[PDB]
Amino acid sequence: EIITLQLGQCGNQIGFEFWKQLCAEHGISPEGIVEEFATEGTDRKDVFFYQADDEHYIPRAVLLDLEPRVIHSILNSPYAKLYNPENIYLSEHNNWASGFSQGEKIHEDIFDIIDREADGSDSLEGFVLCHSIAGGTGSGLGSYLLERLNDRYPKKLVQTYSVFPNQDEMDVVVQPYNSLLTLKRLTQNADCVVLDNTALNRIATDSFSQINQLVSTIMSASTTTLRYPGYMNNDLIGLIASLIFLMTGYTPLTTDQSVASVRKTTVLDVMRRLLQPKNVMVSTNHCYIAILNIIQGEVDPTQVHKSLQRIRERKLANFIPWGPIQVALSRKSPYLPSAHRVSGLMMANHTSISSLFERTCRQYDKLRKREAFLEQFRKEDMFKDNFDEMDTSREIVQQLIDEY
Amino acid sequence: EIITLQLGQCGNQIGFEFWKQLCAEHGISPEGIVEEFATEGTDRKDVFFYQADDEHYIPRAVLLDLEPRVIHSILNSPYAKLYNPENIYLSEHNNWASGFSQGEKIHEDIFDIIDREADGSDSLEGFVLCHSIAGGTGSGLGSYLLERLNDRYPKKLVQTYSVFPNQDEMDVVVQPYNSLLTLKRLTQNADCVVLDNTALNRIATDSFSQINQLVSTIMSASTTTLRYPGYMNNDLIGLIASLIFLMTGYTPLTTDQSVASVRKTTVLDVMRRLLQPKNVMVSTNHCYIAILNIIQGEVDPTQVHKSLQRIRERKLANFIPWGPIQVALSRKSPYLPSAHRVSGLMMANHTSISSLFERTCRQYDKLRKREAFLEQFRKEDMFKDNFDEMDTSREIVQQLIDEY
Amino acid sequence: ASGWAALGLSYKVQWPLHILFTPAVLEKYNVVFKYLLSVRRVQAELQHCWALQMQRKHQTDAIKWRLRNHMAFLVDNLQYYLQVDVLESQFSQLLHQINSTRDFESIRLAHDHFLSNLLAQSFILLKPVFHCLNEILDLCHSFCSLVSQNLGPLDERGAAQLSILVKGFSRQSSLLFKILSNSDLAQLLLRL
Amino acid sequence: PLAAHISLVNKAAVDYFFVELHLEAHYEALRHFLLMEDGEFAQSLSDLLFEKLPGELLNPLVLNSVLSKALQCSLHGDTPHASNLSLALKYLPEVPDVLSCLELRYKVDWPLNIVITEGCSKYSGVFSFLLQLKLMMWALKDVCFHLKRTAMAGSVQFRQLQLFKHEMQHFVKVIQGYIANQILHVTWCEFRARLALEEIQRAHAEYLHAVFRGLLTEKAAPVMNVIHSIFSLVLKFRSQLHPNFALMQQSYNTFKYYSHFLFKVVTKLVNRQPHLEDFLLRINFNNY
DSSP for D228-244 reads HHHHHHHHHHHH----S
Our CA-based measurement puts residue A191 at a distance from the nearest CA of chain C, in whole angstroms, of 7
Q: Is the CB of residue A90 less than 8 Å from the CB of residue A82?
A: no
* Residue D271 exposed, middle or buried by CB count within 10 Å (0-12, 13-18, 19+): exposed
Q: Chain A contact for B210, CB < 8 A?
A: no
Pairing of strands B247-250, B342-350: antiparallel
Q: Is the CB of residue D142 less than 8 Å from the CB of residue D125?
A: no
- Those residues whose C-beta lies under 8 Å from the C-beta of residue B370, and which sit 6 or more positions away, are none
Q: Is the CB of residue B280 less than 8 Å from the CB of residue B203?
A: no
The amino acid at B328: A
Nearest CA in chain B to D169: B242
* Residue B213 exposed, middle or buried by CB count within 10 Å (0-12, 13-18, 19+): middle
Cα torsion D279, D281, D285, D288: sign: positive
Q: Rounded to the nearest 10 degrees, how much is the dihedral formed by the CA atoms of B93, B94, B96, B101?
A: -20
Contact A240 C54 (CB under 8 A): yes
Contact B403 D145 (CB under 8 A): no
Which residues of A fall within a CB distance of 8 Å from B262? 52-54, 56
Contact A323 C190 (CB under 8 A): no
User: Comparing C-alpha atoms, which of B13, B106, B126 is closest to residue B60?
Assistant: B126
Q: Chain B contact for A403, CB < 8 A?
A: no
Q: Chain B contact for A52, CB < 8 A?
A: yes
What are the φ and ψ backbone dihedral angles of B298, each rounded to 5 degrees? -60, 135
Which residues of B fall within a CB distance of 8 Å from D285? 308-309, 312
User: Comparing C-alpha atoms, which of C79, C47, C36, C71 is closest to residue C190?
Assistant: C79
Which H/E stretch holds residue A332? none
Q: Which 8-state DSSP code applies to residue D186?
A: I
Q: Rounded to the nearest 10 degrees, how much is the dihedral formed by the CA atoms of B197, B201, B207, B211?
A: -70
Q: Is the CB of residue D84 less than 8 Å from the CB of residue D43?
A: no
Do chains B and A meet with 3 or more Cβ pairs nearer than 8 Å? yes
Pairing of strands A61-63, B49-51: unpaired
Q: Is the CB of residue D48 less than 8 Å from the CB of residue D70?
A: yes
**Helices C25-53 and C105-121, interaxial angle, to 10°?**
40
Nearest-angstrom CA–CA distance, A140 and A182: 7
Which H/E stretch holds residue A277? none
User: Comparing C-alpha atoms, which of D229, D231, D224 is closest to residue D265?
Assistant: D224
Contact A240 C50 (CB under 8 A): yes
For A277, how many CA atoms within 13 A lie in the half-sphere containing its CB?
8
Contact D173 B326 (CB under 8 A): yes
Nearest-angstrom CA–CA distance, D145 and D165: 11
Our CA-based measurement puts residue B298 at a distance from the nearest CA of chain A, in whole angstroms, of 11
User: Comparing C-alpha atoms, which of A135, A139, A136, A180 is closest to residue A160?
Assistant: A139
User: Comparing C-alpha atoms, which of B230, B367, B364, B345 is closest to residue B291?
Assistant: B345
Q: Chain B contact for A316, CB < 8 A?
A: no
- Comparing CB atoms, the residue among A241, A302, A322 nearest residue C50 is A241
Nearest-angstrom CA–CA distance, C72 and C136: 8
Nearest-angstrom CA–CA distance, D125 and B26: 38
* Residue A52 exposed, middle or buried by CB count within 10 Å (0-12, 13-18, 19+): middle
User: Comparing C-alpha atoms, which of A311, A228, A314, A300 is closest to residue A267?
Assistant: A300
Radius of gyration in angstroms for the set of CA atoms belonging to chain D, rounded to a whole number: 23
* Angle at D254 (CA atoms; ends D250, D260), nearest 5 degrees: 145
Q: Which 8-state DSSP code applies to residue A80?
A: G
User: Comparing C-alpha atoms, which of B150, B135, B395, B66 is closest to residue B387?
Assistant: B395
Nearest-angstrom CA–CA distance, C93 and C87: 10
Q: Chain B contact for A111, CB < 8 A?
A: no
Nearest-angstrom CA–CA distance, B313 and A372: 51
Our CA-based measurement puts residue A241 at a distance from the nearest CA of chain C, in whole angstroms, of 5
Contact A120 B260 (CB under 8 A): no
The amino acid at A236: L
What are the φ and ψ backbone dihedral angles of A390, each rounded to 5 degrees? -65, -45
Alpha helices in chain C (DSSP H): 25-53, 64-77, 87-98, 105-121, 127-148, 158-180, 185-191
Do chains B and D meet with 3 or more Cβ pairs nearer than 8 Å? yes
* Residue D174 exposed, middle or buried by CB count within 10 Å (0-12, 13-18, 19+): middle
Q: Is the CB of residue B130 less than 8 Å from the CB of residue B159?
A: no
Which residues of D fall within a CB distance of 8 Å from B235? 43
* Residue B330 exposed, middle or buried by CB count within 10 Å (0-12, 13-18, 19+): buried
DSSP for C146-158 reads HHHT-SS-S-SSH
Nearest-angstrom CA–CA distance, B262 and B254: 11
Residue A126: which region, alpha, beta or left (left: phi > 0; alpha: psi -120 to 50)?
Answer: beta
3-state secondary structure of C28: helix
Q: Rounded to the nearest 10 degrees, how much is the dihedral formed by the CA atoms of C127, C132, C136, C137?
A: 20
Maximum alpha-carbon separation in chain D: 89
Q: Compute CA distances A20 → A17, A59, A227, B42, B81, whole Å.
A: 5, 11, 15, 48, 56
Which residues of A fall within a CB distance of 8 Å from C45? none
Q: Which 8-state DSSP code applies to residue A34?
A: B
D183-203: buried (b, 16+ CB within 10 Å) or exposed (e) per residue? Answer: bbeebbeeeeeebeeeebeee
Q: Compute CA distances B32 → B37, B78, B274, C21, whole Å.
A: 15, 11, 35, 72
Maximum alpha-carbon separation in chain B: 65
3-state secondary structure of A131: strand
Instruction: Check chain C for breaks (C–N over 2.5 Å) and list the residue before each, or none.
Output: 58, 181
Nearest CA in chain A to B272: A116
Q: For A64-108, where are the E strands, in sequence order?
A: none
Q: Which residues pair with A132 in a beta bridge?
A: A163
Our CA-based measurement puts residue D89 at a distance from the nearest CA of chain B, in whole angstroms, of 25
Q: Is the CB of residue B210 less than 8 Å from the CB of residue B219?
A: no
Q: Which chain A residues touch C if contact means CB-CB below 8 Å?
A: 157, 191-192, 230-232, 237-238, 240-242, 244, 301-302, 305, 308-309, 322-324, 326, 329
Which H/E stretch holds residue C79? none
**Method for this entry:** cryo-EM
- Those residues whose C-beta lies under 8 Å from the C-beta of residue D158, and which sit 6 or more positions away, are D150, D242
Contact D43 B234 (CB under 8 A): yes
3-state secondary structure of A254: coil
* Residue C174 exposed, middle or buried by CB count within 10 Å (0-12, 13-18, 19+): exposed
Our CA-based measurement puts residue D92 at a distance from the nearest CA of chain B, in whole angstroms, of 31
Binding partners of A (≥3 Cβ pairs within 8 A): B, C
What are the φ and ψ backbone dihedral angles of B338, each rounded to 5 degrees? -90, 65
Q: Known binder of ligand: residue B182? A: no
3-state secondary structure of D20: helix
Contact A308 C190 (CB under 8 A): yes
How far out from the chain centre does Cα D232 lie? 17
Which residues of A define the annotated binding site for GTP? 134-140
Nearest-angstrom CA–CA distance, D277 and D273: 7
Q: Which 8-state DSSP code applies to residue A165?
A: P
For B348, how many CA atoms within 13 A lie in the half-sphere containing its CB?
27
Which H/E stretch holds residue A137? helix A136-152
3-state secondary structure of A129: strand
Q: Is the CB of residue A389 less than 8 Å from the CB of residue A383?
A: yes
* Residue D68 exposed, middle or buried by CB count within 10 Å (0-12, 13-18, 19+): exposed
3-state secondary structure of A105: helix
Q: Is the CB of residue B368 less than 8 Å from the CB of residue B180?
A: no
3-state secondary structure of D199: helix
Nearest-angstrom CA–CA distance, A71 and A137: 14
Nearest-angstrom CA–CA distance, B127 and D257: 38
Q: Chain A contact for B341, CB < 8 A?
A: yes
Nearest-angstrom CA–CA distance, D210 and D179: 10
Contact B260 A58 (CB under 8 A): no
Nearest CA in chain C to A245: C54
Q: Is the CB of residue A135 less than 8 Å from the CB of residue A9?
A: yes
Q: Compute CA distances C114 → C17, C97, C107, C118, whole Å.
A: 17, 10, 10, 7
Contact D141 B237 (CB under 8 A): yes
Pairing of strands B247-250, A57-59: unpaired
3-state secondary structure of C80: coil
**Helices B354-368 and B388-403, interaxial angle, to 10°?**
150
Which residues of B fall within a CB distance of 8 Å from A58? 263-264
Nearest-angstrom CA–CA distance, C94 and C114: 6
Q: Compute CA distances C131 → A32, C28, C115, C179, whole Å.
A: 54, 19, 21, 12
Our CA-based measurement puts residue A39 at a distance from the nearest CA of chain B, in whole angstroms, of 20
Q: Is the CB of residue B262 less than 8 Å from the CB of residue A56?
A: yes
Our CA-based measurement puts residue C143 at a distance from the nearest CA of chain A, in whole angstroms, of 16
Q: Is the CB of residue A344 less than 8 Å from the CB of residue A293?
A: yes
- Count of CB contacts below 8 A, B vs D? 74
Nearest-angstrom CA–CA distance, D190 and D38: 19
Contact A51 B310 (CB under 8 A): no
Query: Mutate which of A326, A399, A404 to disrupt the C interface (most C C-beta within 10 Å)?
Result: A326
Contact B263 A52 (CB under 8 A): yes
Task: Write the secondary structure of chain B as one string of H (helix), E (strand) and C (coil).
Answer: CEEEEECHHHHHHHHHHHHHHHHHHHCECCCCCECHHHCCCCCCCCCCEEECCCCCEEECEEECCCCCHHHHHHCCCCCHHHCCCCCCCCCCCCCHHHHHHHHHHCHHHHHHHHHHHHHCCCCCCEEEEEEECCCHHHHHHHHHHHHHHHHHCCCCEEEEEEEECCCCCCCCCCHHHHHHHHHHHHHHHCCCCCEEHHHHHHHHHCCHHHHHHHHHHHHHHHHHHHHCCCCCCCCHHHHHHCCCCCEEEECCCCCCCCCCCCCCCCHHHHHHHCCCCCCCCCCCCCCEEEEEEEEEECCCHHHHHHHHHHHHHHCCCCCCCCCCCEEEEECCCCCCCCCCCEEEEEEEEEHHHHHHHHHHHHHHHHHHCCCCCCHHHHHCCCCCCCCHHHHHHHHHHHHHHHHC
- Those residues whose C-beta lies under 8 Å from the C-beta of residue B206, and which sit 6 or more positions away, are B278
Binding partners of D (≥3 Cβ pairs within 8 A): B
Resolution of the deposited coordinates, in angstroms?
A: 7.7
- Those residues whose C-beta lies under 8 Å from the C-beta of residue A398, and which sit 6 or more positions away, are A361
D107-139: buried (b, 16+ CB within 10 Å) or exposed (e) per residue? Answer: eeeeeeeebbeeeeeebeebbbbbbbbbbbbbb
- Those residues whose C-beta lies under 8 Å from the C-beta of residue B239, and which sit 6 or more positions away, are B226, B233, B292
Binding partners of B (≥3 Cβ pairs within 8 A): A, D
Q: Which chain D residues touch B if contact means CB-CB below 8 Å?
A: 36-40, 43, 73, 75-76, 137, 140-141, 144-145, 148-149, 151-152, 154, 159, 163, 165-167, 169-170, 173, 176-177, 180-181, 184-186, 278, 281-282, 285-287
Alpha helices in D182-208 (DSSP H): 187-189, 198-207
Which residues of A fall within a CB distance of 8 Å from C51? 157, 237, 240-241
User: Comparing C-alpha atoms, which of A335, A378, A359, A151 is closest to residue A228?
Assistant: A335
User: Comparing C-alpha atoms, which of D61, D36, D39, D63 is closest to residue D50?
Assistant: D63
Radius of gyration in angstroms for the set of CA atoms belonging to chain C, rounded to a whole number: 21
Q: Known binder of ligand: residue B134? A: yes
Q: Which residues pair with B247 in a beta bridge?
A: B348
Which residues of D fall within a CB distance of 8 Å from B229? 38-40, 75
- Those residues whose C-beta lies under 8 Å from the C-beta of residue B330, and which sit 6 or more positions away, are B224, B225, B228, B230, B294, B295, B296
* Angle at B326 (CA atoms; ends D178, B279), nearest 5 degrees: 145
DSSP for D139-185 reads HHHHHHHHTGGG----SHHHHHHHHHHHHHHHHHHHHHHHHHHIIII
Which residues of D fall within a CB distance of 8 Å from B236? none
User: Comparing C-alpha atoms, which of B328, A292, C57, A276 is closest to residue D181?
Assistant: B328
Do chains D and C meet with 3 or more Cβ pairs nearer than 8 Å? no
Q: For A170-234, where are the E strands, in sequence order?
A: 195-196
